[PDB]
Copies of this chain bind each other. A is one copy, B any other.
Amino acid sequence: LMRNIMDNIYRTNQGRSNLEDLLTNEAAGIVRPLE
């Protein structure tokens, strides 16, 4: 449950959105996407 809670916090921080978008939270800036 604790692992799932922290993983949920992580995925909410990124969120499902050529270089695989860099997990949506890396040195990307602009994507250039379902909620």
A residues contacting B by CB (< 8 A) are 1, 4-5, 7-9, 12-13, 22, 25-29, 32, 35
The closest CB in chain B to the CB of A1 belongs to B25
**Shortest distance from the beta carbon of A9 to any chain B beta carbon, whole Å:** 6
The closest CB in chain B to the CB of A25 belongs to B1
Q: With A9-B27, A27-B9 given, is the CB distance from A4 to B22 under 8 Å?
A: yes
**Shortest distance from the beta carbon of A24 to any chain B beta carbon, whole Å:** 12
Residues of B within 8 A of A5 (CB): 26-27
- The answer to whether A4 touches B32 (Cβ under 8 A) is no
The closest CB in chain B to the CB of A26 belongs to B8
Residues of B within 8 A of A25 (CB): 1, 4
